[PDB]
């Protein structure tokens, strides 16, 4: 079972410890009292739904910056999935460019600006708490790490229900913040120990956090890069918003040396 962590827990050592053990054992957790405006989240979702109904020929303008950034229409590899997004989410220029590409309204534009700044703050905050949970000196390790924004539209038809919508996988970055679909469940993750899956049901006003491959590398294997998938449980439309804190992009990720011991040989 995925644990729910209270980010307004009064005690730093309890809070950081909860986060670390969740990140090591399950590779994921929910956060409550995250500090992201609930109204901003709903408006971001409204903006997402509306953005996906832009002209196809406009959507196609959402060009890759990184391979996979930008638009992907459903195809025969993964037929139920449509997506948009931008690289370097921390850059107001990058966000604006994305909004220029999708011809967002001015109102929409500034919804995106505010969401990105909020979500990216939650991300830096969570990452720092992870550094703190290990008593690291390098409590700023991520300060030059770029983020990637990606909004997703899942189309499940009656054919799809009972089966999956996306196959089992790990995020390649450090940390992911997911705003799932309020009224359409289906996200599942595998317990590495058992091999069994458990669901990540969309609990209202919460945000889902999971760790990716970069976190495992950085932590020399202590942090779990959770395997997850979304399974179709009903043939409806489905929207989700994801913000990825990635590893460094120019450099190569190797761990703070505090993680590499004679009992933790390098990977």
Ligand X SMILES: O=C(O)CCC(=O)C(=O)O
231 binds ligand X (CB under 6 A): no
β-pairing, 28-32 with 4-6? parallel
User: d(Cα 20, Cα 130) in Å, to the nearest integer?
Assistant: 6
Residue 153 in the binding site for ligand X (CB under 6 A): no
Asked if residue 152 binds ligand X (CB under 6 A), the reply is yes
Tokens of 225: 């890069």
- Residue 230's nearest CA partner among 183, 188, 201, 180 is 188
Which of ligand X, Mg ion, none interacts with 152 (beta carbon under 5 to 8 A by kind)? ligand X
Residue 264 annotated as lining a ligand binding site: no
Q: Is 187 in the site for ligand X (CB under 6 A)?
A: yes
Give min distance, CB of 58 to Mg ion, in A: 26
Q: Is the alpha carbon torsion for 133, 138, 140, 142 positive or negative?
A: negative
- Please tell me whether residue 82 binds Mg ion under the rule CB under 5 A: no
- Specify the DSSP element, H or E, that contains 177: strand 175-179
CB 72 within 8 A of CB 83: yes
Q: Is 240 annotated as a binding residue?
A: yes
Instruction: Report how far residue 180's alpha carbon sits from residue 201's, in angstroms, rounded to the nearest whole number.
Output: 9
Contact between 209 and ligand X by CB under 6 A: the answer reads: no
Pick one of 146, 240, 247, 259: the residue that binds ligand X (CB under 6 A). 240
Give the shortest CB-168-to-ligand X separation in angstroms: 11
Choose which of 230, 232, 245, 246 interacts with ligand X (CB under 6 A).
230
- C-alpha–C-alpha distance, residues 66 and 148, integer Å: 9
Measured from the CB of residue 124, what is the shortest distance to Mg ion in angstroms?
20
Cα(29)–Cα(49) distance, rounded to whole angstroms?
26
171 binds Mg ion (CB under 5 A): yes
Question: Which residues would be at the binding site for Mg ion (CB under 5 A)?
Answer: 171
> Annotated binding residues for Mg(2+), as ranges?
169, 171, 228
Question: Which residues would be at the binding site for ligand X (CB under 6 A)?
Answer: 150, 152, 171, 178, 180, 187, 230, 240, 242
């Amino acid at each position: 079972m995925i644990p729910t962590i209270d980010l307004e827990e009064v005690s730093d050592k309890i809070l950081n410890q909860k986060i670390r053990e969740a990140s090591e054992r399950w590779g994921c957790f929910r956060v409550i009292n995250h500090g992201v405006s609930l109204s901003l989240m709903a408006e971001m979702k409204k903006t997402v739904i509306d953005l996906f109904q832009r002209p196809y020929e406009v959507k196609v303008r959402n060009t890759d910056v990184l391979l996979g950034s930008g638009y992907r229409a459903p195809n025969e590899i993964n037929p139920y999935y449509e997506a948009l997004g931008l690289y370097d989410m921390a850059s107001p220029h990058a966000v604006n460019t994305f909004c220029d590409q999708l011809e967002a309204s001015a109102d929409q534009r500034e919804i995106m600006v505010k969401y990105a700044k909020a979500i990216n703050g939650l991300a830096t905050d969570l990452a720092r708490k992870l550094a703190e949970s290990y008593g690291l000196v390098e409590t700023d390790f991520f300060k030059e790490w770029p983020s990637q924004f990606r909004i997703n539209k899942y189309h499940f038809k009656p054919e799809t229900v009972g089966k999956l919508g996306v196959q089992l996988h790990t995020d390649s970055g450090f940390l992911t913040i997911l705003q799932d679909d309020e009224n359409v469940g289906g996200l599942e993750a595998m317990d590495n120990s058992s091999g069994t899956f458990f669901p990540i049901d969309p609990l209202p006003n919460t945000l889902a956090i999971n760790l990716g491959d970069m976190a495992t590398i950085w932590s020399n294997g202590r942090l779990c890069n959770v395997k997850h998938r979304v399974q179709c449980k009903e043939a409806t439309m489905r929207y989700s918003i994801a913000s990825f804190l990635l590893g460094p992009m120019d450099t190569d990720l190797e761990p703070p040396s505090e993680f590499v011991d004679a009992e933790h040989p390098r990977l």
